[PDB]
Structure 1
Amino acid sequence: SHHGYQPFDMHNPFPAYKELRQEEPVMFDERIGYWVVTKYDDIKTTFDDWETFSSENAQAPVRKRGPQATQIMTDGGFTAYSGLSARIPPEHTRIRAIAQKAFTPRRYKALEPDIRAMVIDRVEKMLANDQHVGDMVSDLAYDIPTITILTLIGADISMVDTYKRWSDSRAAMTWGDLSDEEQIPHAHNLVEYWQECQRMVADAHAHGGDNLTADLVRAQQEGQEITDHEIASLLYSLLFAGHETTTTLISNCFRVLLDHPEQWQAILENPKLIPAAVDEVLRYSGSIVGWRRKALKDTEIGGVAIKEGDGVLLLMGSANRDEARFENGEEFDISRANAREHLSFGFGIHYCLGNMLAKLQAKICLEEVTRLVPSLHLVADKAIGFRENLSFRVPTSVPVTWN
């Protein structure tokens, strides 16, 4: 049964990863139509070889878009595909160089005090609950990265819930195992999402502003080569990638660390261990466990022949456990010296644009929650569910209690 691999089952895929690494490290899975690759060396090499393995299918729906969803999105004027992750050179190179300028550790330093204050506010609100029960997703991880990226882009922060609906739909439409009928509500949401991206660009043309959208329009007006459609597509990209995965990371920091109370206790006694803890959470529980490529010519992965046009699914979640790179890879250890060799941000020309902003927010959340709620405790591992998806491993809640 494909060595136990269930492509959309996100609850605990690592036993199957381990059997694949040992038994069939490059496996053709006809259930999804991809070569499934699970070893670190093969995955890093494939990421590096962008001339042979293009990202152009990284935003293609796993399940073909059905007739009604297709009509909805055509009639709704949905013309988006990918701001960056599935573009290829030369367009990718040009657009990434322009987008990169806004995401530097210096441009976050002015944001850290605001993020930290917001974290403390959310923590205090949670601790006021009557039952002394909380949920690290809805009570913290849900809002913090979303407000951060909305503020950076120039969207009104009153639409957090709308953007979560739109992000849920993008994740489900593109990587979910959806029937034609199940695609319909998501198709309507994607139409709305794209129209708002277009509106924000038009608004920046008309009224300027102090935000990323207005800065990108200013770059265009000052001679830089980027179109309105490419700017709107960058919003489409950042208003999804800029919070969906970070919410998951924050959620997983508490899920995994509270599952390992000796290491929770370690960061209580020494907050300086928190950055390395976040590194090991990214290795052990990355927000994305698999990412796609397309072979541009007949080639090989791990000595297995792959035909031009074949799709490839790189399971970074498996790479990050590979014993050839990570000794005792199935164990969570915040002192792991080479945890930052993980592939949860990818590798190469498409390497995550916002990885430092994600880690910053995870650090701040862990710093303030450990300070204000040292007695935080999980209700139960068996109380955490994961939505089905090919690529994104999202815990739906993280129920917690405290003294």
Structure 2
Amino acid sequence: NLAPLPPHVPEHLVFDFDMYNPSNLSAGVQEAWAVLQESNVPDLVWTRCNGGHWIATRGQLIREAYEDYRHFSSECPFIPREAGEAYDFIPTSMDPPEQRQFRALANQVVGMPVVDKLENRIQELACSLIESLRPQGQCNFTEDYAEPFPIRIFMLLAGLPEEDIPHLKYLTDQMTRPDGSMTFAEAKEALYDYLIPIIEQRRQKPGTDAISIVANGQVNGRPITSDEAKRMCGALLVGGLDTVVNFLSFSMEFLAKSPEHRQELIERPERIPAACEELLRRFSLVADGRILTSDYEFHGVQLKKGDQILLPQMLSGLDERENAAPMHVDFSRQKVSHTTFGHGSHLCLGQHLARREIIVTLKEWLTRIPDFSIAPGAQIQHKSGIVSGVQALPLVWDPATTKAV
């Protein structure tokens, strides 16, 4: 379904890209989004899909817009407009300077310091999880590791019982890839209902878990309110439940289809870190945007106040103008340029946790299960949305080849 073209949007700039259901989705989700960068597509286009909105197709514009919060506000970061308007997570929907305070408190619960004191657990969990699968000679990756691994760590992080994983997970998925059952608002409201009671209890006594830290936090002056606490916790759900999870499946799907790259890491461990960044560029997966604060001519195009513009974080690193032969995975890429963890004042606060989980996965997995491949005769399917992901990943291997360390 297409929205009628607003009077102010050029005739020649219309490219009906459906961010939640791209035409070339069959060739991989990153490949589907890459069409927006073909020789005949303007740097900045307008799509009549999902309420109609702009779409910067080049990392140059993307990076640029993400730096100018004065014009491109995070107030309404999601598409459709109903989703963005409803989006009120702190600080992801705030613009500087208001953001500073909250982002600083949020940084306390997932930043590097937290990731370092968690390294051992993260590592132990990966091993424990993999050692379990190893003798099976097969697995449904997305659900057997890609999900349990990041989520349990996040739940331990937040101090939330693991029983709530399916619940919190489903709702979170509705904010990134709506199955259609519920709107963004409803999903958000549902998550808030889960958090609020928890915040109330934790607000009392201190606490090492994320929710406590936030609930007992102090932003610009007075103590943090429950609503603020709520909005802050929310901003952590997508990352702790839906981003890493999907990223691992993309990266692992690739590794299963490319023995070469696997062998390379297996016999050249030291390259795992660099390999992680390249996979982060290649299989980048987030794409949100901003809303115009006023009428503004941006690169020849006249944007009106209230317009929404999609700045796919996943496109920068695929832009041939920033990375030669972008669709090729080269662990030895001299300059791995990308905006996978975003760009600007909203740079991902969990990228450290992300990278560690990715590095621990590649390390522990390849060591114990170096030789594996996609189950015989199976097609891997992707899904596109605020956060694209992999539907399922059937992997198989011979147990005799596995190892225990």
Unmatched tracts of structure 2, length 5 or more: 1-12, 399-405
Query: Where do residues 1-400 of structure 1 align in structure 2 (5 Å cutoff)?
Result: 5-9=17-21, 11=25, 12-13=28-29, 14=31, 17-18=34-35, 20-23=37-40, 24-32=42-50, 33-59=52-78, 62=80, 64=82, 81-129=88-136, 132-173=137-178, 178=180, 182-183=181-182, 190-220=188-218, 225-288=223-286, 290-339=287-336, 341-379=337-375, 383-389=379-385, 391-400=386-395
* Deviations 1:331-358, CA, capped at 9 Å, x for gaps: 111111221x201111111111111110
Separation in 1, partners of 2:185, 2:222: 33
Separation in 2, partners of 1:382, 1:346: 33
C-alpha displacement of 1:313: 0.8
Distance 1:5 1:17, change over 3 A: farther
SS in structure 2 opposite 1:102? helix
C-alpha displacement of 1:278: 1.2
Cα contact 1:80–1:194 (8 A) shared by 2: no
Matched AA of 2:173: D
C-alpha displacement of 1:369: 0.5
Matched AA of 1:120: C
Q: Report the TM-score when normalising by structure 1.
A: 0.86
Q: Which has the higher contact order (CA 8 A, sep 6+)?
A: 1
Separation in 2, partners of 1:40, 1:388: 19
**Quick one: percent identity of the two aligned structures?**
22
Cα contact 1:3–1:20 (8 A) shared by 2: no
SS in structure 1 opposite 2:357? helix
C-alpha displacement of 1:280: 1.0
Matched AA of 1:392: V
Cα contact 2:59–2:317 (8 A) shared by 1: yes
Distance 1:269 1:196, change over 3 A: same
Separation in 1, partners of 2:77, 2:220: 32
Task: Select between 252-261 and 139-148 the one with higher mean Cα deviation.
Answer: 252-261
Distance 1:332 1:380, change over 3 A: farther
Matched AA of 1:252: F
C-alpha displacement of 1:104: 2.9
Distance 1:111 1:237, change over 3 A: same
Cα contact 1:275–1:363 (8 A) shared by 2: yes
SS in structure 2 opposite 1:36? strand
C-alpha displacement of 1:112: 1.1
C-alpha displacement of 1:400: 0.6
Question: Alignment length, in residue pairs?
Answer: 378
C-alpha displacement of 1:216: 2.6
Matched AA of 2:391: T
1:69 corresponding residue in structure 2: none
C-alpha displacement of 1:189: 5.2
Cα contact 1:36–1:313 (8 A) shared by 2: yes
Task: Select between 161-170 and 136-145 the one with higher mean Cα deviation.
Answer: 161-170
C-alpha displacement of 1:372: 0.4
C-alpha displacement of 1:187: 6.6
SS in structure 2 opposite 1:28? strand
Task: Select between 80-89 and 273-282 the one with higher mean Cα deviation.
Answer: 80-89
Q: Report the TM-score when normalising by structure 2.
A: 0.85
C-alpha displacement of 1:139: 0.9
Cα contact 2:382–2:389 (8 A) shared by 1: yes
* Deviations 1:20-60, CA, capped at 9 Å, x for gaps: 4522221111123111111111111111111111111114x
